[PDB]
């Protein structure tokens, strides 16, 4: 399995050089299902929050993107209440040269810099675009409530 070779390689690279901002690995015996955390970025309203993600590598990874979803509730225009993430590299802009590490980095950038013009959750996108402070407040409150 290319997927498994690659998932293992990525895992080994993570163990060799762990990131600061994230952690990830397989759930028990399941190499295709990972849990991950990402830190709410500093200077975002998610700061201080630890956000848990569930990652499912498809069996034709890396030719198809990993499914990545938040399990921690988060208030964000590109992440809905099921934790689906609307992030181009997880859908149409996937490349097999991307790695879970890069995905987590893009997710972290997505937290820092939402894409409210391509939202998953229009209500939040709208608030983000017209009342950033409210968005910041709510996202902070949700961070405090769910991710801390």
């Amino acid at each position: 399995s290319m997927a498994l070779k690659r998932i293992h390689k990525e895992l080994n690279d993570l163990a060799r050089d762990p990131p600061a901002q994230s952690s990830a690995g397989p759930v028990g015996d399941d190499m295709f299902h990972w849990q991950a955390t990402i830190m709410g970025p500093n200077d975002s309203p998610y700061q201080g929050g630890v956000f848990f993600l569930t990652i499912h590598f498809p069996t034709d990874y890396p030719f198809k993107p990993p499914k990545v979803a938040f399990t921690t509730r988060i208030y964000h225009p590109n992440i809905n209440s099921n934790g689906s993430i609307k992030l181009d590299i997880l859908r149409s802009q996937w490349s097999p040269a991307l790695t879970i590490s890069k995905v987590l980095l893009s997710i972290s950038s997505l937290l820092s810099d939402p894409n409210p013009d391509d939202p998953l959750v229009p209500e939040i996108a709208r608030i983000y675009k017209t009342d950033r402070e409210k968005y910041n407040r709510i996202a902070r409150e949700w961070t405090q409530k769910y991710a801390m």
Binding site: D118, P119, P122, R126, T130, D131, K134
Partner: protein, 75 residues
């Protein structure tokens, strides 16, 4: 002349305008206030979409009228 622009999110913006201000101008004020490009703004008054080249007065928008802003978002 004060007019209000109520966003879909319920936030109301007070704009200082003149009856001769174009919808384009109002959009520019919203851009100025909110950072929202005019091309993302749909402005509606009293069930009518406001067209860029028309003026506030062409729509009988008077002081204390509330226009509605709806942003154009992709999905």
């Amino acid at each position: 002349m004060q007019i209000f622009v109520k966003t879909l999110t319920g936030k109301t913006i007070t704009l200082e305008v003149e009856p001769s201000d174009t919808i384009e101008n109002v959009k520019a004020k919203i851009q100025d206030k909110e950072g929202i490009p005019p091309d993302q703004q749909r402005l509606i008054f009293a069930g009518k979409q406001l067209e860029d080249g028309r003026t506030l007065s062409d729509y009988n928008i008077q002081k204390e009228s509330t226009l509605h802003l709806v942003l154009r978002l992709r999905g």
